[PDB]
Scaffold this motif. Structure first.
Motif, PDB file in Angstrom:
ATOM      1  N   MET A  75       0.844  -1.180   0.000  1.00  0.00           N
ATOM      2  CA  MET A  75       0.000   0.000   0.000  1.00  0.00           C
ATOM      3  C   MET A  75       0.884   1.236   0.000  1.00  0.00           C
ATOM      4  O   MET A  75       0.559   2.253  -0.612  1.00  0.00           O
ATOM      5  CB  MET A  75      -0.957  -0.008   1.199  1.00  0.00           C
ATOM      6  CG  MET A  75      -0.269   0.037   2.557  1.00  0.00           C
ATOM      7  SD  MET A  75       0.341   1.680   2.995  1.00  0.00           S
ATOM      8  CE  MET A  75      -1.096   2.692   2.650  1.00  0.00           C
ATOM      9  N   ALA A  76       2.011   1.131   0.700  1.00  0.00           N
ATOM     10  CA  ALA A  76       2.979   2.212   0.768  1.00  0.00           C
ATOM     11  C   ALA A  76       3.549   2.522  -0.614  1.00  0.00           C
ATOM     12  O   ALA A  76       3.569   3.677  -1.036  1.00  0.00           O
ATOM     13  CB  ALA A  76       4.095   1.849   1.735  1.00  0.00           C
ATOM     14  N   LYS A  77       4.019   1.485  -1.321  1.00  0.00           N
ATOM     15  CA  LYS A  77       4.584   1.680  -2.654  1.00  0.00           C
ATOM     16  C   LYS A  77       3.511   2.123  -3.636  1.00  0.00           C
ATOM     17  O   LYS A  77       3.809   2.739  -4.658  1.00  0.00           O
ATOM     18  CB  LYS A  77       5.258   0.402  -3.167  1.00  0.00           C
ATOM     19  CG  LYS A  77       4.300  -0.746  -3.436  1.00  0.00           C
ATOM     20  CD  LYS A  77       5.020  -1.958  -3.987  1.00  0.00           C
ATOM     21  CE  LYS A  77       4.045  -3.056  -4.379  1.00  0.00           C
ATOM     22  NZ  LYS A  77       3.158  -2.638  -5.499  1.00  0.00           N
ATOM     23  N   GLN A  78       2.262   1.798  -3.328  1.00  0.00           N
ATOM     24  CA  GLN A  78       1.148   2.170  -4.186  1.00  0.00           C
ATOM     25  C   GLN A  78       0.908   3.674  -4.137  1.00  0.00           C
ATOM     26  O   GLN A  78       0.187   4.224  -4.968  1.00  0.00           O
ATOM     27  CB  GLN A  78      -0.125   1.423  -3.776  1.00  0.00           C
ATOM     28  CG  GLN A  78      -0.177  -0.017  -4.264  1.00  0.00           C
ATOM     29  CD  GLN A  78      -0.444  -0.122  -5.755  1.00  0.00           C
ATOM     30  OE1 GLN A  78      -0.074   0.761  -6.528  1.00  0.00           O
ATOM     31  NE2 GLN A  78      -1.092  -1.206  -6.168  1.00  0.00           N
ATOM     32  N   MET A  79       1.506   4.328  -3.143  1.00  0.00           N
ATOM     33  CA  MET A  79       1.375   5.772  -2.982  1.00  0.00           C
ATOM     34  C   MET A  79       2.265   6.509  -3.985  1.00  0.00           C
ATOM     35  O   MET A  79       3.013   7.416  -3.618  1.00  0.00           O
ATOM     36  CB  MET A  79       1.748   6.178  -1.553  1.00  0.00           C
ATOM     37  CG  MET A  79       0.748   5.713  -0.506  1.00  0.00           C
ATOM     38  SD  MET A  79      -0.871   6.482  -0.696  1.00  0.00           S
ATOM     39  CE  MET A  79      -1.736   5.801   0.718  1.00  0.00           C
TER      40      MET A  79
END
Ligand SMILES: [Ca+2]
Ligand SMILES: [Ca+2]
Length: 148
Positions: free
Chosen positions: A72-76
């Motif tokens: 979810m972090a990298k999806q930011m």
């Protein structure tokens, strides 16, 4: 929990458990897209299957809260940043001429839920209105929200 705050952390955290609830904090990748969506980032069918078969090639098939939180972090950033930005700017414009006129800006920001006064409106426009037009351009508008 890479560099988030805590509220958002509590979010996917709450979403994670509500999907597991079996004594094993690991959700199936086939149902991963659901969370990231419930979070804010909508994954594409293609990217899903790749990361899915990915975990099945080692993690058996399910993912742990750590790898997910990491995801979810990298999806930011997969949102192309400016892509989602131009999408919102368009919502206020209504027409899509590249510039949101007072009627367009107020009507949308007010209809959504913010009961803003005309005075506050003139303020934001004038400040970003570099071209000195009776309307705000994507560049001016995006600038304004990039600080205010
Ligand atoms: Ca317009
Ligand atoms: Ca302008």
């Amino acid at each position: 929990m890479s560099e988030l705050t805590e509220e958002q952390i509590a979010e996917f955290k709450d979403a994670f458990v509500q999907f597991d609830k079996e004594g094993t904090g690991k959700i199936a990748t086939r149902e991963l897209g659901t969370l990231m969506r419930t979070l804010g980032q909508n994954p594409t069918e293609a990217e899903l299957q790749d990361l899915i078969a990915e975990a099945e090639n080692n993690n058996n098939g399910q993912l742990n809260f750590t790898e997910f939180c990491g995801i979810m972090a990298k999806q930011m950033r997969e949102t192309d940043t400016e892509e989602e930005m131009r999408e919102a700017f368009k919502i206020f414009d209504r027409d899509g001429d590249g510039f949101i006129s007072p009627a367009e800006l107020r009507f949308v920001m007010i209809n959504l839920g913010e009961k803003v006064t005309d005075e506050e409106i003139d303020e934001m426009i004038r400040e970003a209105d570099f071209d000195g037009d009776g309307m705000i351009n994507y560049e001016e508008f995006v600038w304004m929200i990039s600080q205010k």
